[PDB]
C-alpha cells in the first residue's frame, strides 16, 4: 500500500454533527412528503388547505415505499437511531464487523440507517 | 521640579523575585572550569638541545624557552570581565612597530611597548599577581609540570596521507593515477552528499597546540631561559605560553 489514502478510521465531532443534520433532513423530507399527500387527500374529500392542516386524523400513505419509510423499524429517525448506527456501518470483512460510515463511498448522499440486529 | 513620567500598575505592583541562575551564565561557567591556581608567563622557543642528568646519566631532549621582559600588564576580574586572568606581556618592541593606541595603553599600564601580549586565566582572585611586576624563570620550580600552548609549524596545503594517515592505493598491480588519493568520499545517494567533516586534503599546521604535563628540567635567571623536557609546538622564535599543569598537580 504505497499510495496514501489518508482517511482516518473515525470521524471528528464536526463531521458527526453534519451527519446528524443530514439524517434529520431526510426524515424531514419524508415527513413533508407524507404531509403533502395527506393535504391533497383532504382537498380531494373537500376541505380547505388550512382545514386539512388542522385535521386531527392524518392520512397515512398508501404507496408502499412511503409507508415503509414511515415505519421506524424499517427506516428510523435520527432521534430514534442508536449512536452506533449514525456513525458506523456494518462491514462483514472488518474486525468488529463494523466500519465508519465516512468510509462508505458517497456517504453524504447515500442513506444507511438500519444495521443487522446483533452486528 | 520633577520630570513627567507615567508608570504601569502591572510593572509597579509586580512582586519582586530574583531570576534563577542559568548554566550558560559566565559565573556558572567559571565555577565549572578546570583552571590553574597561579598565573603563567609568555616565552620564546629559542631552540632545542640535550639535557644530561648528572646523577643517573640519562640524556633528554630539552627545548630552551627564553624569558625576556615578561611583565603583568593588567588583570581581569569576575565582577567586570566575567573571569579571573592576568594579561601578561613579553619582550620589548620599537615605537615604529606599535600602534598609537597600543602605545597609549602601554603607557597607562606603565610598561614598555611589548612584543606579545596574552592572558593567563586563573581560578581565584588569590592567583592574580600584582600588576607591573617582572616575571622571571625562577617563577617555576625545577621538576614541576607545566602545560604549554603555542602555534604549530605550518605545513601548507597537505594531502590526506600526511593529514590523516590515509593508507592510499597500491603502488603496482594496475593502480592508475591515484596512488596518494583518499579513495571513496561518500555513499551512493542515501546521503546524496559528502557529509560534513569528511577528511579531505587541506591546509595543515599553523594552529594552536596545548601540550600537557611537560616537566621543567632546568630554570636559570642568569641566561634568562627555562629548559623544558621534550618538544614544543611551532618554529624557532615562536611565542610559547607556560602555566602550571592542571592535570599534574
Amino acid at each position: 500500500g504505497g499510495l496514501l489514502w489518508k482517511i482516518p478510521w473515525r470521524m471528528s465531532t464536526h463531521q458527526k454533527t453534519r451527519q446528524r443534520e443530514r439524517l434529520r433532513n431526510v426524515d424531514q423530507v419524508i415527513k413533508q412528503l407524507t404531509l403533502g399527500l395527506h393535504v391533497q387527500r383532504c382537498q380531494d374529500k373537500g376541505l380547505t388547505y388550512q382545514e386539512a392542516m388542522e385535521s386531527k386524523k392524518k392520512y397515512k400513505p398508501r404507496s408502499k415505499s412511503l409507508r415503509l419509510l414511515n415505519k421506524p423499524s424499517v427506516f428510523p429517525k435520527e432521534n430514534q437511531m442508536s449512536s452506533k448506527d449514525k456513525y458506523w456501518t456494518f462491514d462483514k470483512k472488518a474486525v468488529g464487523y463494523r466500519k465508519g460510515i465516512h468510509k462508505v463511498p458517497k456517504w453524504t448522499k447515500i442513506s444507511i440507517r438500519k444495521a443487522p440486529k446483533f452486528f | 521640579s520633577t520630570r513627567p513620567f507615567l508608570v504601569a500598575p502591572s510593572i509597579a505592583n509586580s512582586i519582586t523575585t530574583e531570576a534563577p541562575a542559568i548554566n550558560h551564565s559566565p559565573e556558572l561557567a567559571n565555577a565549572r572550569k578546570w583552571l590553574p591556581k597561579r598565573c603563567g608567563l609568555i616565552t620564546r622557543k629559542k631552540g632545542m638541545m640535550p639535557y644530561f642528568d648528572k646523577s643517573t646519566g640519562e640524556r633528554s631532549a630539552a627545548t630552551i624557552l627564553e624569558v625576556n621582559n615578561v611583565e603583568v600588564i593588567m588583570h581581569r576580574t569576575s565582577e567586570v570581565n566575567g573571569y579571573f586572568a592576568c594579561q601578561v606581556g613579553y619582550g620589548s618592541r620599537h615605537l615604529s612597530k606599535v600602534s598609537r593606541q597600543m602605545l597609549g595603553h602601554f603607557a597607562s599600564k606603565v610598561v614598555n611597548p611589548k612584543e606579545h601580549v596574552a592572558e593567563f586565566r586563573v581560578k581565584d582572585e588569590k592567583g592574580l599577581i600584582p600588576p607591573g611586576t617582572l616575571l622571571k624563570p625562577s617563577f617555576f620550580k625545577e621538576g614541576q609540570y607545566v602545560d604549554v600552548r603555542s602555534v604549530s609549524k605550518g605545513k601548507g596545503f597537505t594531502g590526506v596521507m600526511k593529514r590523516y594517515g590515509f593508507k592510499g592505493l597500491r603502488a603496482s598491480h594496475g593502480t592508475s593515477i591515484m596512488h596518494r588519493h583518499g579513495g571513496s568520499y561518500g555513499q551512493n545517494q542515501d546521503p546524496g552528499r559528502v557529509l560534513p567533516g569528511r577528511k579531505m586534503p587541506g591546509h595543515m599546521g599553523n594552529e594552536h597546540v596545548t601540550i600537557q604535563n611537560v616537566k621543567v628540567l632546568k630554570v636559570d635567571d642568569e641566561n634568562n631561559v627555562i629548559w623544558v623536557k621534550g618538544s614544543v609546538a611551532g618554529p624557532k622564535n615562536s611565542f610559547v605560553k607556560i602555566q602550571d599543569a592542571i592535570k599534574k598537580t
Binding site: - | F5, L6, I15, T17, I22
Partner: protein
C-alpha cells in the same frame, strides 16, 4: 474616506507587559496569545503585507505554568546537518541552560507566521526569568492609573 487622517498612532509600536506570576494561562496558550500581539492581529489597521505588531515584555517567567509531566519529558530537538548529531534536550535541561524565557520564546516562534518578518516579531518579544528588566520604564501607562500605585514605588521605578 475611513482611511484618510493621521495614521501615526494606529501604527505606533506599543509595549505590552505580562507578569507571568499573575497570569494563570499555561505556557502554550500564553505563547499563542503573545503571537497575535506580535503579529499585530489585535489592531484593526493590520494588513498582511505590513509588519505592524507590538512589543511584548514577559517578566517573572520562572513562574510559568506547564501541565502534565512536560517539564521532565518534553524534548526540544536540534540538528546541524552532519548525521549522528541530533541534539535532544528535555525542557528542564533547556531551562537550566538558558531559562523559562527561552522555552516561551520557542513556543512563540512556532506560533508565528513563517516568513521574512518572523525573526523581527520574535525579536520584539522580550522575556525575563525574574522581575527586574530594562524595559520597565517603557510599558504603556496612563494618568488615570496612577492613583492605584503608591507614591514612593513610582519614584523607585523611575530611578531604576
Amino acid at each position: 474616506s475611513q482611511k484618510i487622517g493621521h495614521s501615526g498612532l494606529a501604527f505606533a509600536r506599543l509595549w505590552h507587559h505580562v507578569d507571568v506570576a499573575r497570569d494563570k494561562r499555561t505556557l502554550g496558550r500564553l505563547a499563542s496569545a503573545i503571537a497575535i500581539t506580535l503579529i499585530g492581529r489585535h489592531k484593526p489597521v493590520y494588513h498582511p503585507s505590513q509588519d505592524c505588531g507590538d512589543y511584548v515584555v514577559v517578566t517573572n517567567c520562572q513562574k510559568i505554568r506547564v501541565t502534565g509531566k512536560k517539564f521532565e519529558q518534553k524534548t526540544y530537538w536540534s540538528h546541524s546537518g552532519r548525521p549522528g548529531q541530533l541534539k535532544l534536550q528535555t525542557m528542564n535541561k533547556v531551562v537550566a541552560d538558558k531559562g523559562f524565557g527561552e522555552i516561551l520564546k520557542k513556543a512563540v516562534s512556532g506560533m508565528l507566521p513563517k516568513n521574512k518578518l518572523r525573526k523581527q516579531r520574535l525579536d520584539r518579544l522580550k522575556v525575563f526569568d525574574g522581575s527586574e528588566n530594562p524595559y520597565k520604564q517603557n510599558i504603556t501607562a496612563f494618568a488615570h492609573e496612577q492613583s492605584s500605585i503608591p507614591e514612593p514605588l513610582k519614584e523607585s521605578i523611575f530611578n531604576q
